[PDB]
Structures are given as C-alpha cells and as structure tokens.
Amino acid sequence: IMTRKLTFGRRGAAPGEATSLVVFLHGYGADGADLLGLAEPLAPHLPGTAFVAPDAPEPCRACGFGFQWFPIPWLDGSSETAAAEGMAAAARDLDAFHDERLAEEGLPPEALALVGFSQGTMMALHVAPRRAEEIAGIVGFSGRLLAPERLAEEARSKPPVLLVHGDADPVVPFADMSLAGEALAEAGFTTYGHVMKGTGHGIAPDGLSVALAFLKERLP
Amino acid sequence: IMTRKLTFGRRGAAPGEATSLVVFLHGYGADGADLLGLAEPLAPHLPGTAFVAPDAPEPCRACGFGFQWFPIPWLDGSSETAAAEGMAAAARDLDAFHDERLAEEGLPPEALALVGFSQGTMMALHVAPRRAEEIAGIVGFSGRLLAPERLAEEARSKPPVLLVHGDADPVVPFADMSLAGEALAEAGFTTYGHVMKGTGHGIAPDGLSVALAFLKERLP
Numbered sequence: 001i002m003t004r005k006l007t008f009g010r011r012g013a014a015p016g017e018a019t020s021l022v023v024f025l026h027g028y029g030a031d032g033a034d035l036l037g038l039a040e041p042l043a044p045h046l047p048g049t050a051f052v053a054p055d056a057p058e059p060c061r062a063c064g065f066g067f068q069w070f071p072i073p074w075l076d077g078s079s080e081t082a083a084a085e086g087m088a089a090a091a092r093d094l095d096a097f098h099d100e101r102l103a104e105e106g107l108p109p110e111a112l113a114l115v116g117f118s119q120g121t122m123m124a125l126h127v128a129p130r131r132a133e134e135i136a137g138i139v140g141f142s143g144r145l146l147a148p149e150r151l152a153e154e155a156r157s158k159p160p161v162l163l164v165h166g167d168a169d170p171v172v173p174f175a176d177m178s179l180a181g182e183a184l185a186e187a188g189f190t191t192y193g194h195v196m197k198g199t200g201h202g203i204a205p206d207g208l209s210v211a212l213a214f215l216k217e218r219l220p
Numbered sequence: 221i222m223t224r225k226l227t228f229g230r231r232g233a234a235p236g237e238a239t240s241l242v243v244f245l246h247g248y249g250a251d252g253a254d255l256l257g258l259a260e261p262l263a264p265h266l267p268g269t270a271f272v273a274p275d276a277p278e279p280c281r282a283c284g285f286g287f288q289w290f291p292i293p294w295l296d297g298s299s300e301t302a303a304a305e306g307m308a309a310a311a312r313d314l315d316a317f318h319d320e321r322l323a324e325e326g327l328p329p330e331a332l333a334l335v336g337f338s339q340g341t342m343m344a345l346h347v348a349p350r351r352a353e354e355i356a357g358i359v360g361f362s363g364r365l366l367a368p369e370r371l372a373e374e375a376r377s378k379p380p381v382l383l384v385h386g387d388a389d390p391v392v393p394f395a396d397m398s399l400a401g402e403a404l405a406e407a408g409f410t411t412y413g414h415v416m417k418g419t420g421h422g423i424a425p426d427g428l429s430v431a432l433a434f435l436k437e438r439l440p
C-alpha cells in the first residue's frame with residue numbers, strides 16, 4: 001500500500017472482550033499517549049469499551065517533537081499545498097487504521113466513536129462522513145471543520161456529532177464551533193454543542209463529562 | 221474504505237492468461253478509453269500483456285466532460301489546496317486500483333508497468349516510488365514530476381523510468397522533462413529520456429516506438 005501504518009496504544013477493556021471502540025485523535029505536537037490518558041477517568045464508566053490512540057503518521061517538523069496529522073503552513077513554514085496533501089493522505093491512513101482496529105476487536109462500524117482534539121478533531125470530522133458505514137458518533141474538542149462547502153456533496157455517512165469548544169480559545173476561535181456546527185446541521189447531521197465557559201484551548205471537566213454521556217448512549 | 225473505486229477497461233491478452241500488466245493513465249479531460257486505444261498497436265508486440273485504463277475518480281469539472289485526477293487551479297478556477305488534496309486522494313485510489321488489478325491478473329508488482337499522459341504521468345511518478353515493491357517500469361509522456369524535493373525522502377521503490385516529451389510542447393514545458401529527469405537521477409532512479417522532435421503536447425510514433433521497446437524488455 002502507499003498506506004502508512006499507525007503505531008498506537010490501547011486500553012482498557014480486555015483484548016477480545018471489547019463491546020465498543022473509541023479512538024482518540026491527538027493534536028499538533030502531541031501523540032497518542034497524551035489523549036490515551038483520558039482512558040483512566042472514562043474506562044470505569046465505559047466497562048466494555050476499548051480505547052485506542054494512534055500517533056499521527058508524521059513527526060511534527062516544526063515542533064521538534066511529537067507528531068502531526070499534517071503541517072500547519074502559517075505556523076510551520078510549510079507550503080499550503082504540501083499541507084493539503086498531508087491532510088488528504090493522513091485521512092486515508094486514518095481511514096485504514098480504523099478498519100484494522102475494528103477487525104482486531106471484531107466490531108462493526110456502529111460500535112466505533114471518534115474523540116478528537118484540535119487537529120485531531122479536524123481529522124475526525126473529515127474521515128467519518130466519508131466512510132461507507134455510519135459510526136456511533138464523534139466528539140470534537142476545539143475543533144475545526146475543513147472545507148465545510150464540500151460536506152453536503154461528500155457526506156456518505158452522517159453519524160451524530162458533538163462539538164465541544166472553549167469560549168476563550170486563542171488557538172482555534174470559538175466562532176469556528178458555530179461554523180462547523182451550522183454546516184453539519186445544514187448537511188443533515190444530528191448536531192450537538194457544548195460550551196466550556198471560561199475555557200481556552202483545552203479539555204475541561206464539564207466538556208469531558210458531557211462527552212462521556214454522549215458516548216455511553218451512542219456506544220454499545 | 222474512503223477509497224474510491226475506479227471504473228476501467230481491458231485488453232487484450234485473455235483474462236487469466238496475462239503474463240504482464242500495463243496500466244494507462246490518461247490526462248485531464250480525457251478518460252481511460254482514450255489511451256486504452258493504444259492497446260491496438262502495442263498488443264501484437266506484447267502478446268502476454270494485459271492493458272488496463274481507469275477513469276480518474278472525478279469528472280472534469282471545468283472541462284465539462286471526461287475526467288480529472290485532480291483539478292488544475294489556474295485553468296480550473298479551483299483552490300490550490302483543494303487541488304493538492306484531490307492529488308493526494310487520487311494517488312491513494314490509484315494505489316488501491318493497482319493492487320486490485322494485480323490480484324485479478326494474479327500477477328506480482330515486477331510485472332506491472334505504468335504508462336501515463338500528462339496528468340497521468342504526474343500520477344505515475346508520484347504513486348510508483350511510494351509503493352512497497354518495485355514495479356517493472358514507468359513511461360511518462362509529457363510529463364511533470366510533482367514535488368521533486370520530496371522524492372529522495374519518500375522513494376520507497378525505484379523502478380526504471382523513461383520520460384518522453386515533445387520539444388515544442390505549449391502545455392507542459394519541455395524543460396520539465398529535464399527537471400523531472402535530473403531529480404529522478406539524483407534520487408537514484410535509473411532514468412531514460414526520449415525527445416519527440418517537432419512534437420507538441422501529444423504522443424508521436426517515435427515516442428511510442430521507444431516506449432514499446434522499453435516495455436518489452438522490462439516486462440515479463
């Protein structure tokens with residue numbers, strides 16, 4: 001394949017005994033281990049759930065450490081086209097990674113949920129709607145939808161979506177939540193929001209709590 | 221998959237009896253049937269060879285007919301990022317299409333050759349070097365190598381390459397041949413050229429003749 005394999009991590013539900021799957025998608029400069037930590041507070045409430053977190057296919061070239069799903073031109077000093085390419089390629093890799101994990105867990109699409117952060121959220125909102133089969137749901141923390149104009153045309157699947165954003169975010173503007181949110185609604189997605197009041201570019205306890213509820217319902 | 225399946229055509233060697241595979245990659249505005257025509261003069265000299273030609277995953281939006289491997293911003297009035305994305309996505313689709321055809325023919329990579337035209341040539345020079353296993357070879361007619369700077373880093377496989385370009389080409393400058401050619405050589409590819417003297421953006425008899433020789437040797 002031209003496909004790139006993603007290294008990853010896993011918990012907590014025992015290998016072979018998972019009844020649902022959630023995949024964490026980390027942000028620019030981080031790695032899977034970062035978000036996979038979220039498994040600690042979530043697992044007791046999602047007993048049958050397996051949690052997986054891949055590292056993005058490329059090292060963060062500007063950061064100097066950690067990984068990126070694609071470079072960020074204005075921050076990275078990379079070309080916008082090289083960035084757009086990384087994004088499309090990274091989506092295919094992630095698409096494949098998903099199929100692989102669902103196999104090893106022996107689960108079907110509707111038992112899978114995506115939980116992203118930043119750049120991870122952008123990857124989730126891009127890949128899921130373009131998969132053949134509708135997944136359980138998506139939780140996107142702060143939070144941007146690439147190319148909202150192409151959503152209606154390219155949406156094969158329309159899983160429920162919960163957007164969670166901090167109203168003091170200096171990195172990704174809080175206004176983006178409404179942008180993503182309106183476009184998902186108009187494209188026919190069942191769309192929910194949660195506002196982390198006072199919160200910047202980060203995941204607050206209240207946001208995490210609402211995500212958990214959303215996940216416990218949508219998940220088997 | 222997010223993967224897109226490509227409709228295609230085939231000849232001439234009998235289904236199940238192919239000993240080698242060549243895939244034609246058409247240009248912006250055309251379709252597979254266009255280049256697949258080349259099978260008529262080539263088949264008698266490549267008796268065991270099967271010829272296949274996919275249609276590019278998208279309709280040519282600006283043309284109005286035929287297909288594109290990706291839009292061409294300055295000609296298409298599409299964004300450069302949307303174009304770069306189409307390119308990376310189209311490469312993954314083509315990557316997959318290849319694996320599929322090699323299966324149905326029951327052949328291995330080293331028995332596959334790519335023959336491109338224009339945009340098709342750009343797709344070939346991008347995908348082949350990024351496949352795990354080295355193919356028989358590539359013939360690229362006029363002819364541009366995307367992102368030559370990334371070749372050395374991203375070249376997993378280095379099949380032989382023959383570049384064929386017309387020295388009167390108003391569409392893709394003849395200078396591009398040397399650009400692609402030097403970069404392939406420096407990246408360690410075995411690289412050949414053929415100049416279609418007097419020829420514009422098109423495939424001349426002499427170019428086709430040299431391609432045939434190249435193919436008869438490299439192919440099983």
Ligand SMILES: OC[C@H]1O[C@H](O[C@H]2[C@H](O)[C@@H](O)[C@H](OCCCC3CCCCC3)O[C@@H]2CO)[C@H](O)[C@@H](O)[C@@H]1O
Pocket residue numbers: 027028029030034035037075118171201202203
């Ligand atoms: O483990 C350390 C704790 O803090 C992390 O916070 C960091 C997160 O590790 C990082 O990915 C982000 O940094 C963002 C900085 C990168 C920006 C976005 C991309 C462009 C460059 C700026 O900040 C959040 C703030 O909670 C996690 O969100 C939180 O779960 C974790 O428990």
Ligand SMILES: OC[C@H]1O[C@H](O[C@H]2[C@H](O)[C@@H](O)[C@H](OCCCC3CCCCC3)O[C@@H]2CO)[C@H](O)[C@@H](O)[C@@H]1O
Pocket residue numbers: 247248249250254255257295338391421422423
């Ligand atoms: O079947 C018609 C004959 O002519 C075609 O020629 C056309 C080809 O069908 C087309 O793809 C290209 O047009 C290029 C025009 C498109 C340009 C490049 C992309 C940007 C837009 C301008 O011209 C060549 C000239 O031989 C084929 O090359 C030749 O094999 C075929 O037998």
Ligand SMILES: O=S(=O)(O)CCN1CCN(CCS(=O)(=O)O)CC1
Pocket residue numbers: 027028029030034062063066075
């Ligand atoms: O894990 S830690 O808590 O140490 C911080 C995690 N991390 C910090 C650095 N960035 C981007 C750097 S840059 O985009 O500003 O160059 C990725 C996220």
Ligand SMILES: O=S(=O)(O)CCN1CCN(CCS(=O)(=O)O)CC1
Pocket residue numbers: 247248249250254282283286295
């Ligand atoms: O098959 S035919 O012999 O009829 C011509 C094949 N064909 C002509 C049109 N172009 C691009 C049109 S545009 O890019 O200039 O809009 C695709 C190639």
Ligand SMILES: [Cl-]
Pocket residue numbers: 177178181182192193
């Ligand atoms: Cl909203």
Ligand SMILES: [Cl-]
Pocket residue numbers: 397398401402412413
């Ligand atoms: Cl040369």
Ligand code: NA
Pocket residue numbers: 118119122144
């Ligand atoms: Na971003």
Ligand code: NA
Pocket residue numbers: 338339342364
């Ligand atoms: Na071109």
